[PDB]
Amino acid sequence: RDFNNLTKGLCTINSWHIYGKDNAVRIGEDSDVLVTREPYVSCDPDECRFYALSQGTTIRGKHSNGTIHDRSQYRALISWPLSSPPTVYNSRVECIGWSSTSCHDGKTRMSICISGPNNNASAVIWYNRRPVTEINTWARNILRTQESECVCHNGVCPVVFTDGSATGPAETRIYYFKEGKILKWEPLAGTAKHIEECSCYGERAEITCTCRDNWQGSNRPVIRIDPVAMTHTSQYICSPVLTDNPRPNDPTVGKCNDPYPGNNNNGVKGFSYLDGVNTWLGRTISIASRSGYEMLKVPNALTDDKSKPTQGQTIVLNTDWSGYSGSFMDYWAEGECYRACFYVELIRGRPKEDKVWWTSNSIVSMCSSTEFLGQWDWPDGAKIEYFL
Amino acid sequence: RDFNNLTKGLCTINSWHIYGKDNAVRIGEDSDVLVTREPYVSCDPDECRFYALSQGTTIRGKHSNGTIHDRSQYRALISWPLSSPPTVYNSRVECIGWSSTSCHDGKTRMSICISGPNNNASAVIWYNRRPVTEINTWARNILRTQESECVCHNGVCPVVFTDGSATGPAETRIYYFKEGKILKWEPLAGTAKHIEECSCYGERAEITCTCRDNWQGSNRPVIRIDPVAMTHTSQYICSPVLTDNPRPNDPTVGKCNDPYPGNNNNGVKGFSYLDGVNTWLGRTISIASRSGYEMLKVPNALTDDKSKPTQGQTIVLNTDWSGYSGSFMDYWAEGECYRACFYVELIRGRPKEDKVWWTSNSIVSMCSSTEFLGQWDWPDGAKIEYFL
Amino acid sequence: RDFNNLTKGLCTINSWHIYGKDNAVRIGEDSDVLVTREPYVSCDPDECRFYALSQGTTIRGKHSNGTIHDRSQYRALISWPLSSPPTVYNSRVECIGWSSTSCHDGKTRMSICISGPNNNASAVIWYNRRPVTEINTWARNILRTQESECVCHNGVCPVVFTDGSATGPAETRIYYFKEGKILKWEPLAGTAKHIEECSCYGERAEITCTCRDNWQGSNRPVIRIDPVAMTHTSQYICSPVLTDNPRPNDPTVGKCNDPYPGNNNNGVKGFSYLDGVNTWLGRTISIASRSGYEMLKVPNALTDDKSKPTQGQTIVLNTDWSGYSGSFMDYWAEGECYRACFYVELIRGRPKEDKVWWTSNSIVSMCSSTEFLGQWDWPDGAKIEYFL
Amino acid sequence: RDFNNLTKGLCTINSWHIYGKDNAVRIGEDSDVLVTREPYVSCDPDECRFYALSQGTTIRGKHSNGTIHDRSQYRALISWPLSSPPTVYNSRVECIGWSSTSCHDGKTRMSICISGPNNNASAVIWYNRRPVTEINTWARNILRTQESECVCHNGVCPVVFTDGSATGPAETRIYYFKEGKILKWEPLAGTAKHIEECSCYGERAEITCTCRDNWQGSNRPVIRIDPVAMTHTSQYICSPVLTDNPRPNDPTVGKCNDPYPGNNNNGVKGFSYLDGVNTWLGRTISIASRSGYEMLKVPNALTDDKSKPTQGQTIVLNTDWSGYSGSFMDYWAEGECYRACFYVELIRGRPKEDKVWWTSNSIVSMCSSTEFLGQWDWPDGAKIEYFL
Ligand SMILES: *[C@@H]1O[C@H](CO)[C@@H](O[C@@H]2O[C@H](CO)[C@@H](O[C@@H]3O[C@H](CO[C@H]4O[C@H](CO)[C@@H](O)[C@H](O)[C@@H]4O)[C@@H](O)[C@H](O[C@H]4O[C@H](CO)[C@@H](O)[C@H](O)[C@@H]4O[C@H]4O[C@H](CO)[C@@H](O)[C@H](O)[C@@H]4O[C@H]4O[C@H](CO)[C@@H](O)[C@H](O)[C@@H]4O)[C@@H]3O)[C@H](O)[C@H]2NC(C)=O)[C@H](O)[C@H]1NC(C)=O
Ligand SMILES: *[C@@H]1O[C@H](CO)[C@@H](O[C@@H]2O[C@H](CO)[C@@H](O[C@@H]3O[C@H](CO[C@H]4O[C@H](CO)[C@@H](O)[C@H](O)[C@@H]4O)[C@@H](O)[C@H](O[C@H]4O[C@H](CO)[C@@H](O)[C@H](O)[C@@H]4O[C@H]4O[C@H](CO)[C@@H](O)[C@H](O)[C@@H]4O[C@H]4O[C@H](CO)[C@@H](O)[C@H](O)[C@@H]4O)[C@@H]3O)[C@H](O)[C@H]2NC(C)=O)[C@H](O)[C@H]1NC(C)=O
Ligand SMILES: *[C@@H]1O[C@H](CO)[C@@H](O[C@@H]2O[C@H](CO)[C@@H](O[C@@H]3O[C@H](CO[C@H]4O[C@H](CO)[C@@H](O)[C@H](O)[C@@H]4O)[C@@H](O)[C@H](O[C@H]4O[C@H](CO)[C@@H](O)[C@H](O)[C@@H]4O[C@H]4O[C@H](CO)[C@@H](O)[C@H](O)[C@@H]4O[C@H]4O[C@H](CO)[C@@H](O)[C@H](O)[C@@H]4O)[C@@H]3O)[C@H](O)[C@H]2NC(C)=O)[C@H](O)[C@H]1NC(C)=O
Ligand SMILES: *[C@@H]1O[C@H](CO)[C@@H](O[C@@H]2O[C@H](CO)[C@@H](O[C@@H]3O[C@H](CO[C@H]4O[C@H](CO)[C@@H](O)[C@H](O)[C@@H]4O)[C@@H](O)[C@H](O[C@H]4O[C@H](CO)[C@@H](O)[C@H](O)[C@@H]4O[C@H]4O[C@H](CO)[C@@H](O)[C@H](O)[C@@H]4O[C@H]4O[C@H](CO)[C@@H](O)[C@H](O)[C@@H]4O)[C@@H]3O)[C@H](O)[C@H]2NC(C)=O)[C@H](O)[C@H]1NC(C)=O
Ligand SMILES: *[C@@H]1O[C@H](CO)[C@@H](O[C@@H]2O[C@H](CO)[C@@H](O)[C@H](O)[C@H]2NC(C)=O)[C@H](O)[C@H]1NC(C)=O
Ligand SMILES: *[C@@H]1O[C@H](CO)[C@@H](O[C@@H]2O[C@H](CO)[C@@H](O)[C@H](O)[C@H]2NC(C)=O)[C@H](O)[C@H]1NC(C)=O
Ligand SMILES: CCC(CC)[C@H](NC(C)=O)[C@@H]1[C@H](O)[C@@H](C(=O)O)C[C@H]1NC(=N)N
Ligand SMILES: CCC(CC)[C@H](NC(C)=O)[C@@H]1[C@H](O)[C@@H](C(=O)O)C[C@H]1NC(=N)N
Ligand SMILES: CCC(CC)[C@H](NC(C)=O)[C@@H]1[C@H](O)[C@@H](C(=O)O)C[C@H]1NC(=N)N
Ligand SMILES: CCC(CC)[C@H](NC(C)=O)[C@@H]1[C@H](O)[C@@H](C(=O)O)C[C@H]1NC(=N)N
Ligand SMILES: [Ca+2]
Ligand SMILES: [Ca+2]
Ligand SMILES: [Ca+2]
Ligand SMILES: [Ca+2]
Ligand SMILES: [Ca+2]
């Protein structure tokens, strides 16, 4: 095998079609399904799988109580076959930790898991299913990473990490790995003022990441990385179609180089595909909570500060719970272009549904179509009342 | 690998022998078996598997309530090892949707799943386990397909779809796929007046499909496809041995080019092997409900409007529930001929057994023998009372 | 791969060492373990597995009630990894039926399953996991076979079947298969008067089978097959150490060419290794019931009508339940000789333990050692009281 | 494949990073997890797995009652995927017995299991998943072995066994196996006075084992083996940092060639990495019970009788239960040195937690880092109260 190179551009996105859905919470009501959160999807050259951070207990197990908590010693990055649920018996552990990222470079997979107490966390970088490199916390305040797949080009796989306050200036670093080893790292540059949980994709030798400004911005920061030069830039999506959550109502003009104000110290992982007129943004429908999900076609959203939608697609109704969302692509598919894909985490349980003592999620995932396909909505589908 | 070509004829069918049986409802009474319906069987060059549309819940799970419903967002095409039951832990999801078909072309497998609301459904065509092509609804009324395997010849795999009313004229199309891409499509032609759920098989470079005329006919429509010319014809099985359900009692003369009247707006997926004197038809024993199943040897059933049985075999007693049935063959077996095979869906639960709130099924499947073998009956075997 | 040839002799048996044990009934008390009976062991060139006839229900399932019954439509030959229990999720179905045999010829495996009502049963012969040949009942009275592995030599795999009364003269046939096809068959010849459930092994191009004379004999019939000439002989083990069950007490002189009288119309599957002074016989310890199990070294047991034990080994104490036993060997191991192996079925439930409504078993299996190893006893280990 | 040779030295150990953790007791509260004890980790050239002695029952099963017992007929050596829990459905049985060791030589794996009553136990040596050699008890008093991986060099895999009293002089033998056959064996020599459960690792063609002197010593015996000459030496870790348990408080001077007194007839399996200044010792934090676990850097611990710690790392808090610990390395990783790894058995249930009737454990495992990483503590995490 040779290292994969990002030689293709994105396919034209005219609509989104269903790709995978695991119905984990429904199925888990009466089967040994692990409690998870922070899911994502990632492809190898011969298979695509679902990934997530387990909580080290099943949903019906008594240890599900307290799983709203983010960072215990019982978490791990797990992967499992596309559209099956994450069960005790089919889930493969990639590494131990409570924050992760993973990607295949064309030869083998790199997986990164961070563990430890808030003031002394460390990242372990695995390559070919073996630990290769370790990185200690640099700001002693919850060293953390993407929560979705990284992207590689000619063996170089850039990864974005953050260490420091989630509600003020922090120390974000872009690491450039090759075979699990560090080639280089650099501090965040550009005009993004705070970075969290970047969702990335690659096309024509450039990696684009859409992140979460948890401090002040309701517009999303964007990091663009050149994996050959091992350099990057940062800015915000200029469009007035605001895509973080919670957020204020949409204005008529957005901000390109500063956080769009109105909501502080909160946010949600999200993503976008920024490709001129072929630009689509995801967002929750609600401006106040992680409810609903929609895709909006917003031509030149990255650079046009008055850009508005020209087409859309509802993914999850506003009467259903959503959550994190992120990008991935099958870089090893046939054809001349890369088909944009995304997943949405459908969070169930606490804190929105507090009649149960757990927090878990199911996954729904779509990929783009060049047809203009009809839309449906894709809820988690479980009845909370059954778990009481 | 090379594309498979339909170079052989059917073996002489002198009786049927047991091929597979999963006892899913019995086993599922105390194990994590998924609720399914619309099952089928399909072979790859190195393995044969059971397929079905999951309902995204186990049978003992509380989400089994309401699984008589046909088209939710929680359904998916799943496959699992021959004769094992469809469990949470052994079921592989092929695609998401509530109507499907799947077939191997000798190189890799094509799987098709349709999802969406009644007025805006779409088909996603997967090839080599990746989405390749998408087709939007053309009549905005439950775009739908076979519910059993398709058949390929030199890489061309024809598939029959229907969109429109189930109880009047509809728009049926025959699509010719190759590597998941559309080579051509054509509207139904011939004298069949309504087509649903075709069950197909191939021999000597011709594909024969036996379908369900849900509108007016109790005789079954037959579509014969030339996968090289990419053309087809349609008619009805001429025989007076009527094989849909419900249906009127058998007459002495059938109809070749029009629906045999007596029952409207209802039916059941079924199949036949139409090979001159080597012709065998399946049907429910009851004329009123999906109960029992038998195979009848009816020489020249396709073209002789007075043809009657010359031999038979009971598969399921009339005191046991049956359901959908369809054809498949192992195109990669050894020998000089293709051995005809079929499955019968054994439906349990609603609406016939309404003491339970679910609907599921188990599978029984047979293949032909050149011997004249003794017969047995093969019920689902589960006791409904145990689920109360 | 080439067909395996029986070129080696048996290793010297000086004691028996533990080979596998699944603890199925213990584990199945709280996990999804299938109810089985009539187990055996069989090796492929790269793996050895446990086999048995499932009853199509778990042990804790409500459908376990009534599993003392021998021949339902819900049975199947299943195989699973050595020493794991037969679970819903790890059990591979080989074929459907209530009587079986299976063996690997060095290239691929042949598996045979018989199904049907008592007066109309049929055998389906599978080869390379596909049905190849079918055989109809010839005496219309429970067509049946070995219940343990067959043995192959240069692709020829002889199999012993019986059809007819279990308590009087019956029609026993020896079939010679090659690639699942019938080369030849012949009626039983020699002085054995009734044959059931032969347990076979091969060495130096000769296959030896030890069977169950269910009609009159408490000594076991022996069939010796030449798989090149496709011919056989039959007689009884001459020794006065009687090895069927139930049986009368041991006399001082046995019978070579007639059934040793005392007990009629009953028996148990068993085995022996008949190799001059390297001869070892298995048997239940009790003369009245399937309780205990021991191995006895009885030099020249086949031909010496006064031969008595010169060494022994207890396998299962007389205060523990045993059941069927049979021979198998790993024909693909390293070294210059074939190591004799056997299994013992540890039956639990009915009819001996009727506080439960089911009948199942676990497996224990040993192979010979050239050392004189210490002995232990190997009970099933489950507590019936826990299942109440 | 070629036999692996121990050509590299140990990497510099500056801290320990998380490697694997299965959370088995937490997960097993509501899933079919086997009861185990005496776990370890061992790598093949393409995968690393967890190993343990099953008790042949799940933790929630009624047969979990009485699993404090060490040596039943229902135990077996099982292996399962790294960091998954040992479940009924994912656990592979390697051999049957109640004492084991296992290692890969670069070509295939050797696994050894001992079974039998106290006065008549025997070892069966498996190679390439087949039984090859058997060894009978030589002192008729619980023949027993390492309970952690063995190490191979150019196909020679030395294994340490003990037979005889656990509380006085016993007969310890070092066996040198190659392809499962005995090349040679020799009685223990040197100044170690009693040996149990050696934990071994290899580097630069030398194998170092740290053992448990159950009779008189609270310092640990050390056996150093030359696998080419097939010779060994023995002594004790000289350091005053005592690492068995229970043990007296640390003195200022230890003993090099005799047991450090204070505690008799008790101990716990443990390990060390003895590499000059790159020396790290593991031990329980408590001197009285199997509680807590810490790693201490003790330069020249093997040869310096006043050596004290210069650095440390807490693995398990003293308020959490620990248990056995042992060494393993991935001998097939990339790079120029071997990365030291270890596991800690986290024992739950009896005898410390007697509100439950079972005894089981979970596993935590770490490997060394050349960074100075922050530390966390890694408890089992299960709540005993949930099992009541
Ligand atoms: C069969 O399926 C097909 C295919 O899916 C169906 O056709 C689809 O129908 C969709 C629904 O109508 C449609 O999606 C909409 O597209 C609009 C763009 O098109 C229109 O404008 C362009 C540009 O002028 C024209 O060319 C075009 O012809 C249309 O006129 C979007 O504008 C739509 O999104 C907005 O509305 C929805 C509510 O429906 C909001 O959720 C969404 O966020 C957008 O509105 C908010 O945002 C904008 C931008 O800032 C504001 O201006 C606006 O006030 C809203 O703001 C409030 O709400 C947000 C969200 O809560 C909040 O943050 C903010 O603060 C404010 O409170 C929508 O995306 C598909 O494009 C169309 N597809 C095709 C190919 O046709 C067909 O209907 C189906 N058939 C049947 C029978 O069902
Ligand atoms: C051991 O096993 C062997 C092998 O299986 C057993 O032998 C099998 O025995 C079967 C049962 O007898 C037999 O199957 C029958 O075959 C008949 C054909 O053979 C006869 O006719 C030919 C032609 O003349 C002769 O050559 C031949 O020798 C025989 O005489 C079929 O006609 C049979 O089917 C009809 O009967 C069954 C009821 O038994 C119906 O369910 C079935 O649908 C058929 O009847 C309906 O349909 C016809 C056609 O329209 C009507 O004319 C008729 O009135 C019936 O219609 C009513 O019912 C239907 C269904 O509900 C409804 O739709 C309609 O409106 C009406 O209400 C049957 O198939 C096997 O061929 C035979 N095999 C061999 C190789 O011998 C042996 O018995 C076993 N041994 C033991 C001891 O058990
Ligand atoms: C550590 O482990 C080692 C290795 O396992 C242990 O050593 C083993 O010890 C075993 C038990 O003593 C021993 O097995 C016995 O071997 C006898 C043969 O050896 C003796 O005879 C020869 C020939 O003369 C001598 O060379 C030799 O030195 C000995 O003297 C067998 O004869 C034994 O079997 C008979 O006894 C058992 C009861 O113990 C019966 O269950 C068994 O069926 C045999 O007896 C019945 O059958 C014979 C034959 O017809 C009759 O003559 C007799 O009356 C019995 O019949 C009744 O019972 C049967 C069964 O219910 C019934 O059908 C019938 O109708 C009647 O009612 C036995 O096999 C191993 O050989 C020996 N191994 C070695 C290598 O030494 C050591 O003890 C262990 N250490 C500790 C400390 O435990
Ligand atoms: C972020 O993470 C980093 C990295 O992990 C954290 O930094 C680590 O901090 C650890 C805790 O302080 C530290 O570990 C200690 O290291 C000591 C060695 O360093 C000191 O001495 C050297 C040599 O002079 C200096 O160079 C160095 O600068 C330091 O001064 C060890 O000595 C420590 O172990 C002893 O203490 C612990 C209690 O903390 C005991 O459990 C342990 O067993 C040791 O003490 C017993 O044993 C000795 C030896 O016999 C006795 O002398 C002593 O009295 C104790 O004996 C009693 O207890 C034992 C055990 O119960 C019993 O058997 C006996 O009988 C007696 O009852 C300890 O290992 C790491 O090295 C350090 N790492 C780095 C790289 O810095 C940082 O803190 C984290 N940050 C935050 C904010 O949390
Ligand atoms: C991605 O591009 C790199 C860089 O050009 C390709 O790398 C070359 O691969 C060939 C084939 O193995 C080698 O002969 C060269 O030595 C490689 N290195 C360089 C720098 O040229 C790589 O093959 C490309 N990937 C694919 C899938 O084509
Ligand atoms: C078992 O013996 C048969 C018969 O001698 C061997 O068969 C020959 O195999 C070789 C190798 O494939 C062929 O060239 C011959 O044509 C085969 N047939 C005969 C009749 O000679 C077979 O190889 C032996 N099996 C093994 C494992 O050696
Ligand atoms: C404290 C910093 C937060 C990110 C901005 C926090 N990240 C981590 C590693 O803890 C996330 C946030 O608290 C949770 C959420 O917003 O859903 C998930 C939670 N993420 C994870 N548990 N992996
Ligand atoms: C409305 C059109 C019907 C076919 C003629 C209908 N098909 C679909 C896709 O919904 C089927 C029919 O209602 C059910 C049955 O007859 O058993 C199954 C049902 N089929 C599926 N759920 N896949
Ligand atoms: C009626 C003839 C019997 C053999 C001599 C009978 N065989 C079959 C195929 O039914 C066996 C016997 O009744 C049972 C037993 O003795 O344990 C098992 C039972 N065997 C099986 N259920 N496979
Ligand atoms: C009697 C000798 C003991 C070792 C010094 C004893 N070993 C065996 C094979 O029984 C161990 C000891 O009793 C137990 C413990 O200390 O945890 C485990 C127990 N080990 C095992 N059950 N495998
Ligand atoms: Ca924000
Ligand atoms: Ca109809
Ligand atoms: Ca359960
Ligand atoms: Ca008898
Ligand atoms: Ca000690």
Would you tell me how many other CB atoms lie within 10 Å of the CB of residue B364? 28
Residue type at position C43: C
In chain D, which residues are followed by a C-to-N distance beyond 2.5 Å, i.e. a gap?
A: none
Chain B nearest-CA residue for C96: B20
The backbone torsions φ and ψ at residue A306, rounded to the nearest 5 degrees and listed phi first, read -125, 5
* Strand blocks (E) in D137-198: 144-145, 157-164, 170-178, 181-187
Query: Would you give the distance in Å from CA B315 to the centre of its chain?
Result: 16
The answer to whether residues A220 and A212 touch, using CB atoms and an 8 Å cutoff, is: yes
Helix or strand run (H / E) with residue A24: helix A24-28
Contacts of C338 in chain D (CB under 8 A): none
Q: Which two tokens stand for residue D312?
A: 């440390």
Is the CB of residue C178 less than 8 Å from the CB of residue C236?
no
Spatial distance between the Cα atoms of A194 and A190, rounded to a whole number of angstroms: 11
**Shortest CA distance to D97 belongs to which of C48, A206, C21?**
C21
Encoded tokens for A84: 């099956």
CB atoms within 10 A of CB B257: 12
DSSP string spanning C195-211? --S-EEEEETTEEEEE-
- DSSP letter assigned to residue D28: H
Asked if D67 and D349 count as a contact pair (C-beta separation under 8 A), the reply is: yes
User: In the block, which residue shows the tokens 């004298």?
Assistant: B191
Environment class of C190 (CB within 10 Å of its CB; exposed 0-12, middle 13-18, buried 19+): middle
Q: Do residues B93 and A82 lie in contact, with contact meaning Cβ atoms separated by under 8 Å?
A: yes
Residue D81 is encoded by which pair of tokens? 């995927």
> Which residues, 6 or more positions from A168, have their beta carbon under 8 angstroms from its beta carbon?
A194, A215
CA nearest neighbour of D160 among D142, D168, D170, D172: D172
Q: How far apart are CA D149 and CA D42, in angstroms?
A: 6
Substitution target in A88, A108, A119, A132 with the highest count of D β-carbons within 10 Å is A88
Pairwise CA distance, residues B14 & D350, whole Å = 65
Helix (H) or strand (E) holding A360, with range, is strand A359-369
Going by C-alpha positions, the residue among A116, A124, A142, A148 that lies closest to residue A52 is A148
- Please indicate whether residue A176 is annotated as part of the active site: no
Pair C14, C297: CB distance under 8 Å: no
- Cα distance between residue C71 and residue C68, in whole Å: 10
The one catalytic residue in B51, B176, B236, B324 is: B324
**Can you read off the two tokens belonging to residue C43?**
């090796």
Chain centroid to CA C272: how far?
10
Cα of B124 to ligand 1 centre, how many Å?
24
Q: Are A213 and A254 in contact (CB under 8 A)?
A: no
Which residue type does C257 have? Answer: N
Summarize the annotated binding site of C for substrate as residue ranges. Answer: 37, 71, 196-197, 212, 290
B341, containing H or E segment? strand B340-349
Residue C347 CA, closest ligand 9 atom number: 17
Residue nearest to atom 18 of ligand 8 (CA): B70
Residue B139 in tokens: 């009549």
- In 10 A of CB B272, how many CB atoms? 30
Q: Give dist(CA A48, CA A332) in Å, integer.
A: 10
Contacts of B268 (CB under 8 A, 6+ apart): B212, B244, B245, B284, B290, B323, B324, B325
> What span, in angstroms and rounded, lies between the C-alpha atoms of A220 and A234?
11
Would you state the structure tokens that stand for residue C277, as one six-digit string? 């002074």
3-state secondary structure of B28: helix
Q: ∠ CA D177-D183-D189 to the nearest 5 degrees?
A: 85
| Number of C-beta neighbours around residue B261 at 10 A | 12
Nearest atom in ligand 4 to the alpha carbon of residue D242 is 63
The rounded distance, in Å, linking the Cα atoms of C265 and C267 is 7
Amino acid, single-letter form, for residue D245: N
Q: By the 8 A CB rule, do C373 and C311 touch?
A: no
Q: How far is CA D70 from the centre of its chain?
A: 16
CB of D182 less than 8 A from some CB of C? no
Q: D117: nearest CA in chain C?
A: C376
Nearest to B90 among C89, C113, C179 (CB): C89
**Distance from CA of residue C114 to its chain's centroid?**
16
* Amino acid identity for residue B186 in this structure: E
Do A315 and A323 touch, CB atoms closer than 8 A? no
Give the residue ranges of DSSP H helices in chain B: 24-28
Cα dihedral C84, C87, C93, C99 sign: positive
The minimum CA-CA distance between A86 and chain D, rounded to whole Å, is: 12
Run of H or E including C25: helix C24-28
Work out whether the CA dihedral C163, C166, C170, C175 comes out positive or negative. Answer: positive
Helix/strand/coil for C62: helix
Q: Give, in order, the Cα–Cα distances in Å from D90 to each of C84, D93, D238, D336, D345.
A: 9, 10, 43, 34, 20
Question: Whole-angstrom Cα distance, residue C224 to residue B71?
Answer: 61
Cα–Cα distance, D298 to C388 (Å, whole number): 57
Task: Write the CA distances from D85 to B297, D31, D43, D276, integer angstroms.
Answer: 54, 10, 17, 36
Task: List, in order, residues 6 or more apart from D358 with CB less than 8 Å away.
Answer: D35, D59, D64, D65, D66, D67, D68, D349, D350
Q: Phi and psi at residue A34, in whole multiples of 5°?
A: -75, 145
Give the annotated binding-site residues of A for substrate: 37, 71, 196-197, 212, 290
Residues 99-128 of D with CB under 8 A from C: 113, 115-117, 119-122, 124, 128
CB contact at 8 A, B149 and B328: yes
CA R_g for chain A: 19
- The 3-state DSSP class for residue B27 equals helix
Residue partners of A107: CB distance under 8 A and separation at least 6: A1, A2, A3, A155
DSSP state letter for D44? E
Question: Can you name the residues that pair with A175 across neighbouring β-strands?
Answer: A159, A185
**Which residues, 6+ apart, have CB-to-CB distance to B100 below 8 Å?**
B38, B51, B53, B77, B94, B111, B112, B113, B114, B145, B146, B147
How many residues are listed for chain A in this entry? 388
Identity (one letter) of the amino acid at A124?
V
Tally of CA atoms within 13 A in the half-sphere of D203 that contains its CB: 21
**Burial class of residue C177 in the structure, from the number of CB atoms within 10 Å of its CB (0-12 exposed, 13-18 middle, 19+ buried):** buried
CA neighbours closer than 13 Å in the CB half-sphere of residue D281: 30
Cβ of C131 under 8 Å from any chain B Cβ?
Answer: yes
Q: With a CB-CB cutoff of 8 Å, which residues 8-37 of chain D face chain C?
A: 32, 34
Tokens linked to B255:
């109809």
For chain B, how many residues are written?
388
**Position A223, amino acid:** I
Which residues precede chain breaks (C–N over 2.5 Å) in chain B? Answer: none
- Strand ranges of the sheet holding D272-273, from the earlier edge strand across to the other edge: D272-273, D280-283, D291-297, D311-321
**Cβ neighbours of residue A229 closer than 8 Å, sequence gap 6 or more:** none
* Half-sphere exposure for C226 (CA within 13 Å, toward CB): 6
Residue with tokens 């005894």, as numbered in its chain: D359
How many whole angstroms separate alpha carbon D94 and alpha carbon B301?
Answer: 58
Ligand 6 within 6 A of C332 CB? no
Distance (Å, whole) CA A136 – CA B151: 57
DSSP D111-127: EEEEES-TTS-EEEEEE
Cis previous bond, C169, omega within 30? no
Spatial distance between the Cα atoms of D342 and C359, rounded to a whole number of angstroms: 45
Closest CA to C377 of D72, D144, D54: D72
D89 at the C interface (CB within 8 A)?
yes
Contact B273, B217 (CB under 8 A): no
**A120 Cβ closer than 6 Å to some ligand 4 atom:** yes
Q: Mention every residue, 6+ apart, whose C-beta is less than 8 A from residue D69.
A: none
Cα C47 to Cα A136, A346, C82, C333, distances in angstroms: 45, 43, 8, 10
Report DSSP letters for C89-125, one per residue.
TTPEEEEESSEEEEEE-SSSEEEEEEES-TTS-EEEE
The architecture that CATH gives domain C1-388 is 6 Propeller (2.120)
Resolution (Å) of this entry: 1.8
Q: Identify any residues that bridge with D359 across adjacent strands, giving them in sequence order.
A: D349
Closest by CA position to B349, among listed B13, B31, B139, B59: B59
Residue type, C219: N
CA-to-CA distance for C193 and B285, rounded, in angstroms? Answer: 45
The C-alpha atoms of residue D141 and residue B85 are separated, in whole angstroms, by 48
* Residues making up chain D, counted from first to last: 388
Backbone angles phi, psi at D28, to 5 degrees: -65, -15
H/E stretch holding D135: strand D130-136
Per DSSP, D109 falls in state E
CA-based nearest residue to A100, from A154, A54, A168, A47: A54
Q: What is the C-alpha separation between D18 and C115, in angstroms, rounded? A: 55
At A293, list the tokens.
């999900």
Give the method of determination: X-ray
Nearest alpha carbon to residue B27 among C78, D4, A85: C78
Measured CA to CA, the distance from residue B98 to residue A228 in angstroms comes to: 45
Q: Return d(Cα C40, Cα C280) in angstroms, integer.
A: 19
